[PDB]
Amino acid sequence: VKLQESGAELARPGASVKMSCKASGYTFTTYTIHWIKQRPGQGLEWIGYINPSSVYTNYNQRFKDKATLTRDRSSNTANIHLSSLTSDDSAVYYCVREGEVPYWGQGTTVTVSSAKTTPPSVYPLAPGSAAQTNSMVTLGCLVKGYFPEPVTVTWNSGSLSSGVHTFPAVLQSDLYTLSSSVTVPSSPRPSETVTCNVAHPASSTKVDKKIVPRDCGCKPCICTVPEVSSVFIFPPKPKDTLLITVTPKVTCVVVDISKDDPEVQFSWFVDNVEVHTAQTQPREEQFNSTFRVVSALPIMHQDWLNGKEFKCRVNSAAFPAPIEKTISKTKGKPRAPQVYTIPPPKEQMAKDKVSLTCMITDFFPEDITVEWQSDGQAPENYKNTQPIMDTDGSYFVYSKLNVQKSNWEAGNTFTCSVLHEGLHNHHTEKSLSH
Amino acid sequence: VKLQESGAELARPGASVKMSCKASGYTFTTYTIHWIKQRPGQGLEWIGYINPSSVYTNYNQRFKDKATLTRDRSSNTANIHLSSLTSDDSAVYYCVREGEVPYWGQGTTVTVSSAKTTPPSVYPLAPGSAAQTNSMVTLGCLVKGYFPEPVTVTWNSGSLSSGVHTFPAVLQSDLYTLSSSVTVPSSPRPSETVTCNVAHPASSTKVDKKIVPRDCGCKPCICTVPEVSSVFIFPPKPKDTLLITVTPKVTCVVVDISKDDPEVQFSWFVDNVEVHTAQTQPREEQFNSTFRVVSALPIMHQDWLNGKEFKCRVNSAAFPAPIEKTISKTKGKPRAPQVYTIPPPKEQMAKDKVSLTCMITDFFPEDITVEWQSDGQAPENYKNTQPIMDTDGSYFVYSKLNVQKSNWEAGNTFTCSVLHEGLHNHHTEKSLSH
Amino acid sequence: KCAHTVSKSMSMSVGERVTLTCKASENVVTYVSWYQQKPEQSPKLLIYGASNRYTGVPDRFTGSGSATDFTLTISSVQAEDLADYHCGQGYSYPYTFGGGTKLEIKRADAAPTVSIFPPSSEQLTSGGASVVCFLNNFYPKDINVKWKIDGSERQNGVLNSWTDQDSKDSTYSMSSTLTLTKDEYERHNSYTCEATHKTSTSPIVKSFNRNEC
Amino acid sequence: KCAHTVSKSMSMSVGERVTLTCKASENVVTYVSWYQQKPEQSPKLLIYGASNRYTGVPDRFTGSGSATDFTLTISSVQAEDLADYHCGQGYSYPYTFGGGTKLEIKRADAAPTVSIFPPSSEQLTSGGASVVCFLNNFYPKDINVKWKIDGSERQNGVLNSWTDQDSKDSTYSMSSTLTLTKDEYERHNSYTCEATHKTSTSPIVKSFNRNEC
Numbered sequence A, B: 001v002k003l004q005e006s007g008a009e010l011a012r013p014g015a016s017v018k019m020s021c022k023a024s025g026y027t028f029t030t031y032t033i034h035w036i037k038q039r040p041g042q043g044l045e046w047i048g049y050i051n052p053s054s055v056y057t058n059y060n061q062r063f064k065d066k067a068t069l070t071r072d073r074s075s076n077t078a079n080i081h082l083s084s085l086t087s088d089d090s091a092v093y094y095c096v097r098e099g100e101v102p103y104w105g106q107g108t109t110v111t112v113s114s115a116k117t118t119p120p121s122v123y124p125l126a127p128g129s130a131a132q133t134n135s136m137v138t139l140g141c142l143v144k145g146y147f148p149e150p151v152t153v154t155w156n157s158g159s160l161s162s163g164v165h166t167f168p169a170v171l172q173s174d175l176y177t178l179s180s181s182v183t184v185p186s187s188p189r190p191s192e193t194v195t196c197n198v199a200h201p202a203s204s205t206k207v208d209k210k211i212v213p214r215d216c217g218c219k220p221c222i223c224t225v226p227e228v229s230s231v232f233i234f235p236p237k238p239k240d241t242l243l244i245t246v247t248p249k250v251t252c253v254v255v256d257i258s259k260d261d262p263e264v265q266f267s268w269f270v271d272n273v274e275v276h277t278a279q280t281q282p283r284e285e286q287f288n289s290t291f292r293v294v295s296a297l298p299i300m301h302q303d304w305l306n307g308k309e310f311k312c313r314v315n316s317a318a319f320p321a322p323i324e325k326t327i328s329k330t331k332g333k334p335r336a337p338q339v340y341t342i343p344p345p346k347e348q349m350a351k352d353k354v355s356l357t358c359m360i361t362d363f364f365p366e367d368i369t370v371e372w373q374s375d376g377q378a379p380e381n382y383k384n385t386q387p388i389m390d391t392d393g394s395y396f397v398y399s400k401l402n403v404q405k406s407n408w409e410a411g412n413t414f415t416c417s418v419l420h421e422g423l424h425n426h427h428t429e430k431s432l433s434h
Numbered sequence C, D: 001k002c003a004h005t006v007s008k009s010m011s012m013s014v015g016e017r018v019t020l021t022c023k024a025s026e027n028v029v030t031y032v033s034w035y036q037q038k039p040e041q042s043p044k045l046l047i048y049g050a051s052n053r054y055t056g057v058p059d060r061f062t063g064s065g066s067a068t069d070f071t072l073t074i075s076s077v078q079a080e081d082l083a084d085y086h087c088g089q090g091y092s093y094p095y096t097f098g099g100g101t102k103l104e105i106k107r108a109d110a111a112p113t114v115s116i117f118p119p120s121s122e123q124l125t126s127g128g129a130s131v132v133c134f135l136n137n138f139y140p141k142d143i144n145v146k147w148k149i150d151g152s153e154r155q156n157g158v159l160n161s162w163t164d165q166d167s168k169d170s171t172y173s174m175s176s177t178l179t180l181t182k183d184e185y186e187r188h189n190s191y192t193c194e195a196t197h198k199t200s201t202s203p204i205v206k207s208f209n210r211n212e213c
């Protein structure tokens, strides 16, 4: 028992278009059928009107001889041929049928407009952080500058539909724009994401905007004083913290020192405790134009290894504040490098020299050291790349050894030793031989 | 017509002390005078009692032969000599005069305690911000850990006294503590300050604590900066200067910009010539405390490749001189990387994933770029080490590709492409396959 | 040839007996037909002729009239009664419908729930800044939005879209964006989106001070 | 040698005729003397002997008694009547005063005015955290403080100091601090200082997040 209308969208002022309110659910040919319209927040305005056969065809004022109402009883359809379109014809057009005008269709909305079809822009609305209280972080999405209407805003691909509030679009100087809100629980947002799925039908612009939040953390006070000096604390070499007979010294040196800054007086803190360095003060070295005071304090292996801080408090006359900086460790749960060996490739076998790389991988942290060993002792040439974080979050390093064909082919055996904490007794090593 | 008592504060349990209820306002010598006490929230306990002359001297139980009541009629004064002080003697001691015990004095409070005179600590109580409504921001001050009593809390040096509520001190394990509140209008607080003035008489600790509101979060970094900015010109990415469809942009950006330095007006020089950038001026970005104006001017490949300079002249109001800096090339005679391929090692062949490295060596300069290609197109995971200068003066880089055994053994073929100027047509590539 | 509907809108609570008439310019001897047009959907023939309820229509609904007047009494409102209503002159072409009335339902006061949002990082880079301010779920629609650029000032460039009376919720949830210059925004810090409804005798505010978030 | 004062405390409103007696162990033939001891100050000889008001004493005050009993009627209370009162046996040493009564004045109910304060930034750095909670101006003193570490729990380490019946205000204004571990406090967030007086049948709460600046 139904009739629905077809095609009729945007049209240039004056031009024409034809809509066809299609029916079904009974005998068409025995019925009178009108067309009516309604403009923005307006009343109902009756327009054309044909009849069963096609005899009478009563139209009216605002569309006389400029809009034509056909019919095709045979294959159930009514029509309207909007011709001279005055901008004031913009509306949605229904299609009923007499008896007393009982069954109105859906409606198609024409828009008599000179404007150009302009695709919008999505602007995700994330809250200004604050505190996520009351368990309800309402979100929103902004669609601005689209012409004409309408647009379909759906949340998380229509999955979400608890409490959303899409907003009636508003015309603003030939440009439409509106927004939509979405009341959700606090917890799911940070975690399980929310997207703004929208499409401008008349443009075909399907878009999904993931509402990412900001970082209200106040970490903006990074500066650099050009007047007084600035100290830098450097970690001990991994080999020192590994080889037991070697004593791991931690340094901390100042830079911008003139012909006034006294001995500076260095003082360290191994976990809010203070201690006697080792008179570590080779100090002042007439550099580029300023000096440089060193403080190479040795410390127990196990201390760094267990993970202890290292403050380097210092006090001078010019200093506005007795500055200091720690240097604890690289954190986390230590991973041992798989460490492998790859002899010179096939392609490179006629060259004068060759390259055997030592491939250490997926370890943690970068605190590691590498050496090779031709014959049976410390060699040269070997160079080590710098620890770079691979896919999973691990690291890996290559160590290339250079030698001649005579040396290689003479099966002199070369060895790659790797020192990393996660290693068995803080060490491992593999060997290559022809 | 009055009598007031003197000295008698804290005393070790057992030891002694003498208080002297002093009089005036009449003839002393013709009067009988007692002493009475009252302990914490207790009743009145009569004690000694002398007489006019000094004849009768009726004492009582709790103080017989252990407290002595003297007199000195001549120079108007009564006395008490507390000797064996049992902790249960701690109280305030009055001093009346018979007729029927009409004129009691002020009272001195003894405290028989083994405790040590401990000075307190002031802790200002600022409200947890919130909204200052109802026009009455009540404040408070906390005095904790003081022995013995008492203490004098005064607000804004006794000036304020509208509605304050000082709180009865309470003993808590040999430690006293209490607080005081102060009802004031909202407006004056933020503005006209309020201090907490207090003193522990028996210690002489006069202290004034300012009642600042709860120190909030995001504080303006606003690091201070001197005489204008400094610009830095950065070279284009090697891949841009190599891939022909990509256009090699050379940048140059300023840093120390305040809320005054205008648009700066950037202008480039390609060999003492000047040219029109590409309105390359995304400019000013509110950074740490200062802005940052960018100037990403594109340029022909062959220009850089041939070796042309790049001045970045700029002029502002604050600028003492229209500064500019070029960025020509790396010079030297270009060496092409030998570029090889090494599939996953023997040792690592049972693992979940594997590593095929691309070994590019002895080239020049570091201006080079690398990509892999599983199947036959752009892949993921591959990471590139940073160019490091080998023995002879050349360079070399490793590029690791990560994949699974199924992928590898399935002979899907992977390819490593390398782009370096010294290459045939600025490019080369090798491939690995199982 | 011309017919007008009484009370452009009517706010009634359930069970309330609501009536609205339609006055016509001439005599139209009982040839009017009231149509019910619920939001976002096609009208429906409610009653025809004088009264005579069309099939599929509740006994509560009732028509009346003769020549220049035509009532439509509804003893008791409902959720099924939220919509626009307008008489349709059917005597003689051209046919002309009433102006239409909007029956808004009452449900006792309910304050808003504001939430101010600062312009996205993507918009700010293209010039421009849209400070949005959603004041959801509230009744009635009688409320005034007042923005404050920094200290205390409205300005122009405010877009205030409401929404229709929700069906189950029965509340308006108007938004109020505010567009302006990129750096004009950067010249200011604290953006206040004040709002004054009836519910709270005091104003409902919410804002922020332009910081890295 | 022993004398006891009737009603340890008495709550009367102005104009009320209040009386309190003092019973003695033996016969003390009219040798008692009532002393008035207003807060924070030395006692004052009110009446002596049987009655006979001491000079500088109001006609309202009145003594009576003989041997084992001794009254002290006061037709009409006042501001000048807030204090403790206790008879003093003066027949024969050792002299012994009553237990003392506390005349609290009535003024009709008045709810408290709570205000919770979070431990200062200075105390927290020395270890320890004192959450204070002032419940000022209220009548009567019949109230129960209940703290909540985060969710819902009292705990111990609470210090509840009252204050004496104000003279003009006539209200108690008890405070209630709460000391604890520095990080224990850091392990929790929302601190609730609930309070249940008579006035409001419902409880009076006030609290905070801890994430407030």
Ligand SMILES: *[C@@H]1O[C@H](CO[C@H]2O[C@@H](C)[C@@H](O)[C@@H](O)[C@@H]2O)[C@@H](O[C@H]2O[C@H](CO)[C@@H](O[C@@H]3O[C@H](CO[C@H]4O[C@H](CO)[C@@H](O)[C@H](O)[C@@H]4O[C@@H]4O[C@H](CO)[C@@H](O[C@@H]5O[C@H](CO)[C@H](O)[C@H](O)[C@H]5O)[C@H](O)[C@H]4NC(C)=O)[C@@H](O)[C@H](O[C@H]4O[C@H](CO)[C@@H](O)[C@H](O)[C@@H]4O[C@@H]4O[C@H](CO)[C@@H](O)[C@H](O)[C@H]4NC(C)=O)[C@@H]3O)[C@H](O)[C@H]2NC(C)=O)[C@H](O)[C@H]1NC(C)=O
Pocket: A232, A233, A234, A235, A236, A237, A249, A250, A251, A255, A256, A287, A288, A289, A290, A291, A292, A296, A325
């Ligand atoms: C005039 O004075 C000086 C000196 O004159 C010369 O200066 C050199 C640089 C040339 O210019 C030369 O021409 C001049 O003649 C001059 O330079 C100095 O001032 C700048 C000011 O910025 C200062 O800058 C810092 O540089 C750091 C790098 O410096 C190290 O590394 C380089 C390169 O490898 C090396 O050349 C340096 O010598 C230095 O390396 C030291 O060297 C000592 C010996 O000299 C080694 O000693 C060993 O120590 C170990 C134990 O540690 C054992 O005891 C061994 O036995 C012993 O031999 C050290 O091992 C070795 N250290 C290392 C690590 O190799 C640079 O790191 C630093 O950057 C930090 O700060 C910035 C902010 O400014 C941050 O953004 C950075 O991120 C970084 O901070 C850290 O960052 C990490 C993350 O990356 C975080 O995790 C950390 O938390 C964070 N903080 C900390 C504390 O780590 C900064 O750039 C130079 O270092 C100075 N020069 C020297 C030689 O030190 C002045 O400019 C000039 N005056 C003026 C006005 O211009």
Ligand SMILES: *[C@@H]1O[C@H](CO[C@H]2O[C@@H](C)[C@@H](O)[C@@H](O)[C@@H]2O)[C@@H](O[C@H]2O[C@H](CO)[C@@H](O[C@@H]3O[C@H](CO[C@H]4O[C@H](CO)[C@@H](O)[C@H](O)[C@@H]4O[C@@H]4O[C@H](CO)[C@@H](O[C@@H]5O[C@H](CO)[C@H](O)[C@H](O)[C@H]5O)[C@H](O)[C@H]4NC(C)=O)[C@@H](O)[C@H](O[C@H]4O[C@H](CO)[C@@H](O)[C@H](O)[C@@H]4O[C@@H]4O[C@H](CO)[C@@H](O)[C@H](O)[C@H]4NC(C)=O)[C@@H]3O)[C@H](O)[C@H]2NC(C)=O)[C@H](O)[C@H]1NC(C)=O
Pocket: A222, A223, A224, B223, B224, B225, B232, B233, B234, B235, B236, B237, B249, B250, B251, B255, B256, B287, B288, B289, B290, B291, B292, B296, B325
């Ligand atoms: C507040 O303002 C700023 C901004 O706030 C942030 O700053 C950062 C640094 C953090 O502190 C953060 O917390 C703050 O919020 C702040 O910092 C700035 O001031 C300092 C002042 O010294 C300035 O210092 C310089 O830093 C140079 C390094 O900067 C580059 O590299 C770092 C690390 O990789 C990177 O983080 C930076 O972003 C920057 O990298 C740029 O980034 C842009 C995009 O941001 C890329 O864009 C690409 O460009 C290419 C084309 O080039 C294509 O178009 C791409 O498509 C496009 O995307 C660039 O590619 C990328 N460049 C590079 C190279 O990767 C450092 O180089 C510089 O050192 C020179 O000067 C010293 C003397 O001072 C010399 O001694 C050095 O040697 C060097 O000079 C050159 O040296 C070589 C030899 O080594 C010579 O051969 C050359 O001749 C010689 N001259 C020249 C001209 O080359 C210097 O240290 C920071 O750079 C500023 N921050 C930024 C982001 O730029 C302020 O400190 C703060 N204010 C105050 C008062 O504190």
